Amino acid sequence: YELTQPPSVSVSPGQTASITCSGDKLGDKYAYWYQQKPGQSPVLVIYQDSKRPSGIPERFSGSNSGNTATLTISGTQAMDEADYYCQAWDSSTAVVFGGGTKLTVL
């Protein structure tokens, strides 16, 4: 895995959770965030650094600056509990991947 993510992030209900994703010159690529509940389809929650796909709650936001992309979930709900994966897309090169973060609410 060419991108580094914390192994885990924990928050109490309603608190804001943030997940980081770092790698050399990450700011040069676009960041993409996938929510992955074990045994279910991955869901794209943020794309192109900071954009939100239709149907994704407004509490999901993201940014990408320098060597670090960040996913933020405000008002974290029990249904947000999942593994989160960052990926970065370059105009040319093949996708690079983070190793995932387990988000726990409690």
Side-chain angles (χ1 to χ4, degrees):
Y1 287 119
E2 284 305 299
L3 305 180
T4 64
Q5 298 183 233
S8 83
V9 162
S10 301
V11 293
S12 282
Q15 183 179 8
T16 293
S18 296
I19 309 296
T20 60
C21 174
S22 67
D24 206 43
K25 303 189 303 298
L26 177 61
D28 288 336
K29 292 173 298 295
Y30 286 107
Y32 292 69
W33 287 95
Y34 287 91
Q35 178 188 74
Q36 220 302 279
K37 302 186 186 193
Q40 314 185 33
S41 179
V43 172
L44 176 68
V45 297
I46 289 291
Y47 69 100
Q48 282 175 37
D49 294 341
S50 56
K51 312 200 164 190
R52 186 180 50 80
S54 193
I56 303 303
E58 298 186 358
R59 68 184 184 267
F60 292 80
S61 68
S63 61
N64 186 7
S65 306
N67 64 5
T68 300
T70 303
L71 173 71
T72 300
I73 307 175
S74 68
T76 306
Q77 313 281 299
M79 66 181 200
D80 300 333
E81 230 172 48
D83 293 304
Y84 289 81
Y85 294 94
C86 66
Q87 287 175 21
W89 284 62
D90 196 27
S91 187
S92 59
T93 67
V95 182
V96 284
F97 306 81
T101 299
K102 174 189 181 181
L103 180 71
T104 302
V105 176
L106 269 225

